[model samples]
Target chain A: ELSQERTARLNELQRALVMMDSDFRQIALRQTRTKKLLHWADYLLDSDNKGIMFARLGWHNPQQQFPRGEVTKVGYRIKDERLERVWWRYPDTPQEGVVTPLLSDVEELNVRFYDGKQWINEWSNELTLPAAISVELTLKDYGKIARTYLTPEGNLQ
Target chain B: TVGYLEQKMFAAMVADNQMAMVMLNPKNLKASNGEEELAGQTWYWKVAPVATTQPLLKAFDVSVAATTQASPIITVRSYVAS
Candidate 1:
């Protein structure tokens, strides 16, 4: 019985990790969601998921306006043993975008973005995007789960 | 929430392994900013809300009905989206 419970915990954590992995793949595949005729700046965006709910985040979509689309300033954060996603339709659109809860028992989430040379704790409005990123998910019992992903142009695109 | 949207967004793409990649042709979008081309297959949408009141009201400022971080759900549309 003890082993079964342990396996259940293992299964859930691994499941969350897989979902996060796909998110990186999505980012990597989208080097440029913009059309070639348009400039790269046109679709530029500066910067989520799963159940049992625990993880970390920061995401900016390339399509920053619509018609074409607008700032997909999205994020996933852990709160009160739960992980939630926040999507502001517009950049800092005052109050809301679209919020959804993700996981539970999440302790903390830490991240590092590579600036070509080394990994930094956070990234800002730099002229360009980070070369890569790392996700550190800490669940109540899982301790810490870390995964690294290359950004768009760094290509897994 | 927009979070669910992202999952659904990728849900289609990951399952679309048949596809070369997970992307959209800006040229085929609702607006012709890329090109006055056809928004074939799928076209992207936007999210905006109503009922809170922002236009005619709130001129001199009232309750300042705050917009929630994530409302029930909303969307954008165009004639081409089929």
Candidate 2:
């Protein structure tokens, strides 16, 4: 049997767990955004011949939950096509062409709840889509990676 | 005969967290003169509320002169960025 004080403490603990769960969800969301930004950055820099891509992260709140307060906003400026270091603001800089922003998307993965000795743990995996390809597979891949990170291989099987 | 191209301008809308329509400007943009001395001319502009005015709207205006700084005072405006 739980005493009144013990029950209050347990309630507080549960509240803390909820807060932690919210925080973890936000982390997963941001990681998803970051991964997408990085992938698109790589593509723009490596393949598309678009000027250097740099992601300005955390201008606004970075701790909010997924999509709501989660990843918030992301911005990237494309360097001039000819003059690599020149941003779009400097229009006078000689440019053979114009570089523009790319498209990316974020999604949530499987959410799980676990019961610990004293608290409940919630985990989720989020993903960012680099291209218009398979979004489902991307989420699965992220989930697989997250599961591997949390538990050993074959544990989920 | 020299062919003339149509001049078209587009502006970037500034918004708040709620994604509400904050401000709009027809001329708020970075401009260039296509010359090296004045090559890097750039500026930012936007409309906002009247109550929250700032020190002033500031930007880098370039000059064609050889010296690093030779641009005259161009009064932009003062307003809050809604």
Candidate 3:
């Protein structure tokens, strides 16, 4: 009788272990899918075809004695499109600043910012835009698209 | 050795040259000697070429208190060129 009880307990333990293992696998798979979705979203917004590259010009701090920095914001506008203006704020600000104004199709890009001491001359960069423009999507739209692309099991659909 | 937070902040600024205007938040920064008094204030950064010569770019040094009365500033004088 004791032998039969022991066998039953052992079977129950094995079944429990199998269930736990399956759960763990499902969790890990879901995490992987989530990670992939995030990466895809990042690529869509920041990839070369979809994003703007800013040349690194050096910086200046006019007040040498103070030896401190100030908060600054940089603004850009997509040529001929008033609604396409964008701003980049640093030291941990907002997502609206994440991607520079998409100038992938424009001949020249216009930029504005304070040069520490004063506003530098409105700078323009001469460059060729990509043949194809990236799809414009809002942050909410990106999130929605990511979710829609994944199956209920978190796998890409 | 720079603290982890300091290193990360510097790395982020150096990652892109187009990041010309970076505002360093004093709260997020690890304080240097006597820098603790400057907490709760914002600092501005202006990154440009060091001079017309070698094309090496860095943050120019200027007086923070004299430049702007609105905010206390500290400029990172020599940012590594990209």
Return the clash pairs for model 2, or none.
Answer: A65-A70
lDDT accuracy of residue A22 in candidate 2:
33
Better of 2 and 3 by TM-score: 2
TM-score ranking of the models: 1, 2, 3
TM-score of every candidate: 0.44, 0.20, 0.18
lDDT of each: 0.41, 0.25, 0.29
Q: State which docking tier applies to candidate 2.
A: incorrect
What would the TM-score be for candidate 3 when compared with the true structure? Answer: 0.18
Q: How would you encode candidate 1's per-residue C-alpha lDDT over B13-66 as one tens digit per residue?
A: 322221111123322332221111111323222222223243332111011101
Q: Is candidate 2 or 3 superior in lDDT?
A: 3
lDDT of 1 by residue, A1-157 (tens): 5999888777866666665665454442211222111111211222122211111223433342223332233455555656665444333244444665655788766667788899876554233456777777777876787888775552221
lDDT of 1 at B35: 12
Candidate 3 structure lDDT: 0.29
Query: In what order do the candidates fall by lDDT, top score first?
Result: 1, 3, 2
- What is the docking quality class of candidate 1? incorrect
Off by over 4 Å in 1: A2-4, A28-73, A87-100, A154-157, B1-76, B79-82
Q: What's the CA RMSD for each of the models?
A: 15.2, 19.5, 22.5
lDDT of 3 by residue, A1-157 (tens): 5899667655643553353223222211111111221112212223322222221111344432122333322222333321122333332243555333332233322222232354332322122211111222222111211111111122233
